[PDB]
Design a protein around this motif. Sequence first.
Motif, short mmCIF file in Angstrom:
data_model
loop_
_atom_site.label_atom_id
_atom_site.label_comp_id
_atom_site.label_asym_id
_atom_site.label_seq_id
_atom_site.Cartn_x
_atom_site.Cartn_y
_atom_site.Cartn_z
N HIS A 4 30.63 -10.26 -4.42
CA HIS A 4 29.28 -9.92 -4.85
C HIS A 4 28.89 -10.78 -6.05
N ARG A 5 27.60 -11.01 -6.23
CA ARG A 5 27.11 -11.80 -7.36
C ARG A 5 27.56 -11.18 -8.67
N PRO A 7 30.15 -8.30 -9.44
CA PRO A 7 31.16 -7.33 -9.06
C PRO A 7 31.66 -6.52 -10.25
#
Length: 40
Positions: A4-5, A7
């Motif tokens: 994820h961008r 996390p």
Amino acid sequence: MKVHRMPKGVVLVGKAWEIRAKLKEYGRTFQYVKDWISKP
């Protein structure tokens, strides 16, 4: 997209995020005006 961008996992929630913002807003070198006035 394996990750994820933004996390989670290992994160520290404190004032470290605030102190970096405050020091950035105040620690802004305003030399733009000085470099703008051209007076031989």
